[PDB]
Amino acid sequence: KIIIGRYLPGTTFVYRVDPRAKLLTTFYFIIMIFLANNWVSYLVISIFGLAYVFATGLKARVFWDGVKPMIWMIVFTSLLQTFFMAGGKVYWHWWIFTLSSEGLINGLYVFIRFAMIILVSTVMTVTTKPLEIADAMEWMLTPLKLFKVNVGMISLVISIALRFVPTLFDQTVKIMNAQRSRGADFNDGGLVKRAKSVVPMLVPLFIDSLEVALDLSTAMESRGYKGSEGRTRYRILEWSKVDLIPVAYCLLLTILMITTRKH
Amino acid sequence: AIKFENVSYVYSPGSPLEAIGLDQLNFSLEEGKFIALVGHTGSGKSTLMQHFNALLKPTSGKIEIAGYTITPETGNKGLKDLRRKVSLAFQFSEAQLFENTVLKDVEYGPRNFGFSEDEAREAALKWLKKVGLKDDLIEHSPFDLSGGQMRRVALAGVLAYEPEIICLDQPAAGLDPMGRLEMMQLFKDYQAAGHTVILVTHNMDDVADYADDVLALEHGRLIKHASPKEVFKDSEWLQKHHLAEPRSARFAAKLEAAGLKLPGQPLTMPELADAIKQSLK
Amino acid sequence: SDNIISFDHVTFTDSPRPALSDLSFAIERGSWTALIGHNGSGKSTVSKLINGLLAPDDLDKSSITVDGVKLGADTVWEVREKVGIVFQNPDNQFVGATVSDDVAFGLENRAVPRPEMLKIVAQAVADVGMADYADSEPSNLSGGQKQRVAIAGILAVKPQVIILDQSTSMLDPEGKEQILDLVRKIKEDNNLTVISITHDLEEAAGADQVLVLDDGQLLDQGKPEEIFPKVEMLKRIGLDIPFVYRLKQLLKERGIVLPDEIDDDEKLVQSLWQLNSK
Ligand SMILES: Nc1ncnc2c1ncn2[C@@H]1O[C@H](COP(=O)(O)OP(=O)(O)OP(=O)(O)O)[C@@H](O)[C@H]1O
Ligand SMILES: Nc1ncnc2c1ncn2[C@@H]1O[C@H](COP(=O)(O)OP(=O)(O)OP(=O)(O)O)[C@@H](O)[C@H]1O
Ligand SMILES: [Mg+2]
Ligand SMILES: [Mg+2]
């Protein structure tokens, strides 16, 4: 089952990290991802992302099964970029497409970059409750409170967008089961037949997911959620000693790449 | 028959939040009967229903139903005939309706099972009239309806293509009294036509009225498999196992407590009335 | 009268007909009112109108006053703190990531201090008999468990008006009795008002008032012993009569005549015992 955007309960140390510190670490790692220019810098960001994923405590098989389809999509996009752009040595040059050493290098780099963006986003969303993510997002946008900007609305919209993907897969499962019960066969024929069977589902999936996303806000409003101002917290939101773990993780990483970048 | 041998199901087996939905089920439901699946909330009735039509595969054990053998390693391939023969009405009708209109949704089922457009339309109209849905609602969206209307749409879609096994996860929830009685009589008449009906219910009066056999669950364990009379013989056993008694039996107990003993043990309202008249005679 | 709906029209969305048409009724303060009617009469529409989630078609001729404040655009939040509604679908009630978080959401919105919130959420979760599921995802629950969580989330804040939109439909009889007793006890202790939209006539027979709704119109309104004797009216509109009245009618058609003043199980039992004594 897909685990991106979906909160998986756990007890390891990354679950006790502050959601604000976790969000800052995620955004900082995403920023550092674009600062990788050398092969060794990409490798360093690779070990750091893999350590971040291992800190989640989920089994590697579970994480892989949760991130598989989007990993395959990233692989497809990287292969497309490898074919479209070429340079330096040429291997095959078969028809209008071509395969090049520079193209392969940049395809690998784009795959690594997008993959670890996905991994850090998934680690953030799995270990943090969606409303905790919204609270951390609103806290981060506190300076944006200047110029009379409704930061709470933006944070709630961001949380809804983050929850959109899990709602997409939940609705996919729901309609797949509903159609299976009444005789649909998504496991018959070749790829053409399966695509034909799954193509009438696309509009219902997105419409139902949007309806669920809006129903979440309806449920919040019905129970008195004027906004994030003036509320109390069931869960304590305070800095702690464990919050120094991301900082060093955000520090050491930086140091490495400063001594590891191409420049 | 529908046979379960040592059927266990575990929700998220590898996760730390592992929960055993069903634990070593062993029973044999007879074809052509009315079976009432009873139990407390969270006892595993919906998991059992989803196991009937192979929506969930068992973690362990074997299921034999409608010429099909479902094992932990069965898979979703080649299961269209099983669901041709076995139909399931979900506990929530929202998780069942997906089509643009009520008519299209109801006749989705017949279309998949070899009904021509004329036959599918006639069956859909007949079963929409049978479930007491207004004629003008057949071209409206299934989601622009009330909860009971959605329940009626789901029931009509389930019963449209004539399955030989009808599994109903609380189909009477959300239905008004007249609609509730009409649905119960519709299911009984369907069973009288040569079909098997399995019914998850929280109303013991329905069990005493329509059920031929009773299947009682508790925490995923099958605690009793007997007729309604034998299930409702003892009230201490019923209370001990999170279960209740028909209101007719409760009223008979109240009458006996006040000093008016009744012959036998009434379980249905006409039976209780006959017993009261016999006692007063 | 805690709630006052007066000349209320609602057409959904477009729809050709109004869900409610010229609806007017009053809810007595600190009472139990059972809103009953066939499927398709605007009971959930009434519930969502009282909250403020829906607005009447015409605003300057329809009135909705909840505990003295006229419901509107500028007083919706002053009303939502008075009205807590358990929805017909429990999935539409859940906000938090666990059962305790969902129960505590409404206490967070009311600025209840966390030391009190801990006790209130624990007591509410234990009250609906879900203490073993406090850390569970509310979507990974059975229908009755989801109903219990939805009821607990509303009974924790103890609003002046509790609306229950068929909140006992998917509960086992033990759970039905337990949660009905819990709601009654909370109502009596806190001097609250309960509107129970239900299809169970046994629960409606025990209410203080019964509102009868037909095609979005108030067909009848009164006490249970003034409504349920009208067998023809109830059967004509898709309703029925509770257990005791049906038993009385079968006894009458079987030759045993009983006084019409009998409206409860105990009264019927005593009357039958007296008949047997002779
Ligand atoms: N998706 C799920 N993931 C994990 N546990 C689940 C899930 N669905 C149900 N459960 C749990 O499995 C058990 C059985 O649930 P099930 O839905 O079979 O109950 P039920 O008998 O249908 O109950 P109800 O009468 O409330 O509908 C319960 O403890 C429930 O919390
Ligand atoms: N989302 C919607 N869009 C359009 N019409 C709707 C919608 N929901 C309900 N209706 C219609 O409005 C009317 C009132 O239905 P409502 O849901 O208020 O009744 P109810 O008594 O709560 O339902 P039930 O007893 O069947 O659960 C019905 O005619 C129904 O079809
Ligand atoms: Mg269930
Ligand atoms: Mg409704």
Author numbering:
A (entry chain C): 3 to 265
B (entry chain B): 2 to 282
C (entry chain A): 2 to 14, 17 to 281
Sentences from the paper on this structure:
Energy-coupling factor (ECF)-type transporters mediate the import of micronutrients, such as folate, cobalamin and pantothenate, in the majority of prokaryotes. A tripartite ATP-hydrolysing motor (ECF module), composed of a membrane-embedded scaffold protein (EcfT) and two cytosolic nucleotide-binding proteins or ATPase subunits (often hetero-dimeric - EcfA and EcfA’), forms a functional core complex with a membrane-embedded substrate-translocating protein (S-component). Structural and biophysical analyses of ECF transporter complexes from three different organisms, with different substrate specificities, and from different laboratories revealed that the core complex and minimal functional unit exists in a 1:1:1:1 subunit stoichiometry. Based on these fragmented structural insights, a model for the transport mechanism has been proposed in which a substrate-free solitary S-component with an outward-facing binding site topples within the membrane upon substrate acquisition, associates with the ECF module, and exposes the binding site to the cytosol, thereby moving the substrate across the membrane.
We substituted the catalytic glutamates in the Walker B motif in both ATPase subunits, which are required for ATP hydrolysis, to glutamine. While the purified double mutant (referred to as 2EQcryo) cannot hydrolyse ATP, it is still expected to bind nucleotides, which prompted us to use it for cryo-EM analysis. We obtained a reconstruction of the mutant solitary ECF module 2EQcryo in lipid nanodiscs at 2.6 Å resolution, which shows a markedly distinct conformation from any structure reported so far. In both ATPase subunits, Mg-ATP is now bound and engaged with the signature motif. Compared to the open conformation, the ATPase subunits have moved by ~4 Å towards each other to adopt a closed conformation. Because the two long coupling helices (CH2 and CH3) of the EcfT subunit are anchored into the grooves of the EcfA and EcfA’ subunits, respectively, with conserved X-Arg-X motifs at their C-terminal ends, the closing of the ATPase subunits into a tight dimer forces these C-terminal ends to move towards each other. This movement thrusts the coupling helices from the membrane interface into the lipid environment by ~9 Å, changing their shape from concave to convex. The convex conformation of the coupling helices adopted by the solitary ECF module upon Mg-ATP binding becomes incompatible with the shape of the S-component. Concomitantly, the transmembrane regions of the EcfT subunit that are connected to the coupling helices, undergo a ~13.5 Å rigid body translation and a ~25 Å rotation towards the coupling helices within the lipid nanodisc, thereby moving into the space where S-components dock. The movement of the coupling helices towards the membrane plane upon Mg-ATP binding, shifts the hydrophobic surface boundary, thereby reducing the thickness of the nanodisc density to ~36 Å in this region.
